[PDB]
Amino acid sequence: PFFPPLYLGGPEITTENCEREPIHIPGSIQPHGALLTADGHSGEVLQMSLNAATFLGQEPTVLRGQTLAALLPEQWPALQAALPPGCPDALQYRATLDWPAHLSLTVHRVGELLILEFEPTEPHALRNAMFALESAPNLRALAEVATQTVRELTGFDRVMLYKFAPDATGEVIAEARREGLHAFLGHRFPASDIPAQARALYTRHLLRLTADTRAAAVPLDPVLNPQTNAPTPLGGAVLRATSPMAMQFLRNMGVGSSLSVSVVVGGQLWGLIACHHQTPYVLPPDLRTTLEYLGRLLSLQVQVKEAL
Numbered sequence: 001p002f003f004p005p006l007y008l009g010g011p012e013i014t015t016e017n018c019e020r021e022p023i024h025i026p027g028s029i030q031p032h033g034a035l036l037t038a039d040g041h042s043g044e045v046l047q048m049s050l051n052a053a054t055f056l057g058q059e060p061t062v063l064r065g066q067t068l069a070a071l072l073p074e075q076w077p078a079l080q081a082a083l084p085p086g087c088p089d090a091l092q093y094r095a096t097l098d099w100p101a102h103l104s105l106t107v108h109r110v111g112e113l114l115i116l117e118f119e120p121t122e123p124h125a126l127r128n129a130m131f132a133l134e135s136a137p138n139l140r141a142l143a144e145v146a147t148q149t150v151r152e153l154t155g156f157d158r159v160m161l162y163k164f165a166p167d168a169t170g171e172v173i174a175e176a177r178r179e180g181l182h183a184f185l186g187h188r189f190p191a192s193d194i195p196a197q198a199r200a201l202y203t204r205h206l207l208r209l210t211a212d213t214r215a216a217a218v219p220l221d222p223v224l225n226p227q228t229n230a231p232t233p234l235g236g237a238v239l240r241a242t243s244p245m246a247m248q249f250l251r252n253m254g255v256g257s258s259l260s261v262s263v264v265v266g267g268q269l270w271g272l273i274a275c276h277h278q279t280p281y282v283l284p285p286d287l288r289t290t291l292e293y294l295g296r297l298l299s300l301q302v303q304v305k306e307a308l
């Protein structure tokens, strides 16, 4: 059972209680984007990341109480139509906004709350890349093709296929890596390195990232959803702040930027496409959607090859 988060008197997480960190409700985001939450009926802005002015041109206390009908007149109708009450929380509305300078808008619904993520935005290849995954003659070749394809798409310094054993230990079973990096191929890691609540979250929410492993989280205020007087679920928000314990592991590994995609086989977390960059690095939003698609395609191909 989860500890309370830090803003509800919960303890700072240690290695004795890795699995009890409520990573889905950090009440904070990464600073490379802005997050608002809004009432799913009124469009009233209820919560604001403290950096909202950087991206949206208005202070949190000025955005607070304004409606999405006022703030996003061109998107609000489509947004309402796209994400009705009771729709799946995996369902996304996506728009490209003109900003005086594009801004990618990603929206999902959790209960009666809309969660709005704003971050800056920037097939012949992909088709051949899919056919390459399809064409791999065994699981090892599939793993190698998948890591090299993702490295070519992203430019990440390292792309690993990280496979879970039945005891939830992990192993790097393939990797594409920059010249000069030390090999992790064949290295195994304890189950606690990706604790049980992270594995559960990653079965439902298939991509997460840390753009800068040194960056302080930006608070969401007010931190509790005024609808519920309870924490705002951020498991479906790519801007969600990462566990400080996970961020520290990456810094100690010389990793400035991390991104992973779930590999899901018969509804169980099989592994991760796990990416590192030495330098902080914001993967463009369009490249993430492509990487989510490849994760789904890889998941289907892994299920087939392992039966053999």
Ligand SMILES: *C/C=C1/C(=C/c2[nH]c(/C=C3[NH+]=C(/C=C4\NC(=O)C(C=C)=C4C)C(C)=C\3CCC(=O)O)c(CCC(=O)O)c2C)NC(=O)[C@H]1C
Binding pocket: 014, 015, 016, 017, 018, 019, 021, 023, 162, 170, 172, 184, 189, 192, 193, 194, 195, 198, 208, 209, 210, 241, 242, 243, 245, 246, 249, 258, 259, 260, 272, 274, 275
């Ligand atoms: C006491 C808690 C600890 C802990 C928690 C923790 N770890 C994650 C997430 C990840 N850990 C990963 C581990 C590895 N990445 C590698 O490259 C290697 C080895 C080469 C390992 C072992 C990975 C891949 C993830 C997923 C996220 C990512 O892709 O960067 C979480 C969840 C983070 C979040 O989503 O907020 C947590 C709570 N890790 C520990 O090592 C102990 C100290």
